[PDB]
Amino acid sequence: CMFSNKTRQDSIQKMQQEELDLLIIGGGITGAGVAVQAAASGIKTGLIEMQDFAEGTSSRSTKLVHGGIRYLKTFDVEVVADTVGERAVVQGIAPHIPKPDPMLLPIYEDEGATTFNMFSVKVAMDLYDKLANVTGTKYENYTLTPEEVLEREPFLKKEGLKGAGVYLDFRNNDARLVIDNIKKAAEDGAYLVSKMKAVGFLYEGDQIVGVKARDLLTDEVIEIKAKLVINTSGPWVDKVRNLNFTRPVSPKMRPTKGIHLVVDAKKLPVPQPTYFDTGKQDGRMVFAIPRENKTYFGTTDTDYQGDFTDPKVTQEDVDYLLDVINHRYPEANITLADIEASWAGLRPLLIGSSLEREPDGLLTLSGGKITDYRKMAEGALRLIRQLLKEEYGIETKEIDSKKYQISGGNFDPTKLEETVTELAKEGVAAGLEEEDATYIADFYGTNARRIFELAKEMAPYPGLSLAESARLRYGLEEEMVLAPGDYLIRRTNHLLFERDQLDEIKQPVIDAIAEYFGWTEEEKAQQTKRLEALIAESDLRELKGE
């Protein structure tokens, strides 16, 4: 009853009846973070997202919160300083999301110029730690001799190995970070509508005072009045600005594509995130990263033109990434045939982040990275509060976003294990396996409680376990799942990181969702056909010649 299709319909109607203080365009991490800070400050807030929440770039990143340690090679210390400081801030407000996962960075001497050597990587990590106040911490950096490295990863290229550095950085489920931000703002009374696209502006003089939005489920278009409209559409930032035709819009964005590939862990069983120069002397570094029972690689950097909602993996990208990986791991012999899942996204690159008011009144928050996200929203709020005070003489609350914990993260950021262990008991008590109880505690954090409540008093959907049925029900009832892909792709890691177990639950999931919505056989068939398209896409069936 909290955040579902019904809630959405309520919000759609409410947004047409009352003038909002702020209308947000874009339901990615940027807009999600602004929405959370606005609602918590006591501001009539609305947010429209044409796709599912996080379906943009916020669910296509490398899935970590890091500080960009490579930028220290050119001495961009302020950029690196701001980012690593936010690393701990985000951990503090979303303890169940970003988790510490020390990086292993091997150095070679037989591949030409490198980002670091044995000596400079040590200095780099010490500075990295200093800027992050990690220097004393247990996550304090250190180095490893070639032998010690080969211990952790005996399949790594031995030729040229000079050793490695091990420093702290965070693995992070980006889609979840966005959703569990959205859910907070909702809990704080904001109107949040997915599947709604901004398609034109409402004007008073030359000033924007609302938007024409198309309900993408009914195709009906409504008017939404608002005192302030802020554009947080990521790589779509210019397309939204260009809805206004007053003057030549100078482009502020120039998005590049990056892809990622997933393989079963056994084929390349890195025990921890591994980062290194490509060996191609192209000025790039690539990862190999464990997640559940897979490792995944990227990434990739190409100029892009075309559909922004569905960027695709090309054989050029696969050749490059697999060329890099097989060079670094001489005996893994990985090919397209081993790829279980994949994904591609567009970087919202400027020309870090930018906050602008344009002549027509439109506010735009662009660029940046997921890690910077709540620092970006803070700047936006500072200006939004000022503008509300100025132009509408309306006062608002001052909050401390660095301490405002999002949905499911309302617990001591220092006690993740104790909180998971404690919640895992309630789950076993709700009637679930200890394994599933723990996974759910760690994944949804505090929200696991609600999931367990639903598990205790419900009958599992046909073809699904009680644990799985509880999660799906929760997603449908409190995470605005509208399509099976939202759930299998975005609310969970089924598609990307559990592909070998997807086929067993795919249909049962669609059945239960179509059941919950009361779909026609027409709609259920349309939804099914679409899911298959998304799966075939991630599976790279076309590149495999299937």
Ligand X SMILES: Cc1cc2nc3c(=O)[nH]c(=O)nc-3n(C[C@H](O)[C@H](O)[C@H](O)COP(=O)(O)OP(=O)(O)OC[C@H]3O[C@@H](n4cnc5c(N)ncnc54)[C@H](O)[C@@H]3O)c2cc1C
**Residues near a second copy, by CB under 8 A:** 72-75, 77-78, 81, 117, 119-120, 123-124, 126-127, 130-131
Tell me which residues in 292-321 interact with ligand X (CB under 6 A): 299
Closest approach of Cβ 231 to ligand X, in Å? 9
Contact between 55 and ligand X (CB under 6 A)? yes
d(CA 97, CA 375): 17
The two beta strands, 191-194 and 45-49, are parallel
Structural contact between residues 75 and 50, judged by C-beta atoms closer than 8 angstroms: no
Closest approach of Cβ 199 to ligand X, in Å? 7
Closest approach of Cβ 74 to a second copy, in Å? 7
478 binds, among ligand X, a second copy, none (CB under 5 to 8 A by kind): none
Contact between 413 and ligand X (CB under 6 A)? no
Q: Which is nearer to a second copy, 134 or 321 (CB)?
A: 134
Closest approach of Cβ 50 to ligand X, in Å? 4
Contact between 51 and ligand X (CB under 6 A)? yes
Report how many residues bind ligand X under the rule CB under 6 A: 38
Residue positions counted in the chain: 546
198 binds, among a second copy, ligand X, none (CB under 5 to 8 A by kind): ligand X
d(CA 43, CA 20): 8
Would you call the peptide bond into 299 cis, given omega within 30 degrees of 0 as the criterion?
Answer: yes
Which of 225, 227, 347, 494 is in the footprint of ligand X by CB under 6 A? 347
The two beta strands, 196-204 and 191-194, are unpaired
Work out the burial of residue 518: count CB atoms within 10 Å of its CB; fewer than 13 is exposed, 13-18 middle, 19 or more buried.
exposed
Which of 210, 234, 408, 484 is in the footprint of ligand X by CB under 6 A? 234
**Side-chain half-sphere of 38: how many Cα atoms within 13 Å?**
34
Which of 44, 60, 385, 473 is in the footprint of ligand X by CB under 6 A? 60
Closest CA to 423 of 445, 453, 454: 445
Structure tokens at 404: 């405002």
347 binds, among a second copy, ligand X, none (CB under 5 to 8 A by kind): ligand X
Q: Which is nearer to a second copy, 111 or 129 (CB)?
A: 129
C-alpha radius of gyration, the chain, whole number:
23
Structural contact between residues 363 and 227, judged by C-beta atoms closer than 8 angstroms: no
Closest approach of Cβ 132 to a second copy, in Å? 13
Structure tokens at 143: 């180095």
d(CA 541, CA 57): 23
Closest approach of Cβ 240 to ligand X, in Å? 5
Contact between 28 and ligand X (CB under 6 A)? yes
11 binds, among a second copy, ligand X, none (CB under 5 to 8 A by kind): none
Closest approach of Cβ 196 to ligand X, in Å? 6
d(CA 497, CA 341): 8
Which of 99, 152, 162, 197 is in the footprint of ligand X by CB under 6 A? 197
Contact between 173 and ligand X (CB under 6 A)? no
Q: Which is nearer to ligand X, 432 or 480 (CB)?
A: 480
- The amino acid sitting at 546 is E
Contact between 370 and ligand X (CB under 6 A)? yes
Q: Which is nearer to a second copy, 117 or 256 (CB)?
A: 117
Q: Which one of 1-9, 50-58, 152-160, 181-189 is the stretch in contact with ligand X (CB under 6 A)?
A: 50-58
Contact between 274 and ligand X (CB under 6 A)? no
Q: Which is nearer to ligand X, 26 or 427 (CB)?
A: 26
Which of 84, 208, 240, 441 is in the footprint of ligand X by CB under 6 A? 240
User: Would you tell me the crossing angle of helices 466-478 and 434-444 to the nearest 10 degrees?
Assistant: 20
Q: For residue 379, what is the enclosing H or E element? A: helix 373-392
Q: Which is nearer to ligand X, 235 or 279 (CB)?
A: 235
Closest approach of Cβ 333 to ligand X, in Å? 25
| 3-state secondary structure at position 354 | strand
DSSP secondary structure letters along 409-428: --S-TT-HHHHHHHHHHHHH
The runs of H, that is alpha helices, within 18-145 are: 29-40, 77-93, 118-132
DSSP state at residue 333: -
Distance of CA 134 to CAs 104, 139, 195, 239, 323, Å?
17, 7, 42, 41, 35
349 binds, among ligand X, a second copy, none (CB under 5 to 8 A by kind): none
Under the rule (CB under 6 A), what is the footprint of ligand X?
25-31, 48-51, 55-58, 60-62, 64-65, 197-198, 232-236, 240, 258, 299, 345-348, 368-371
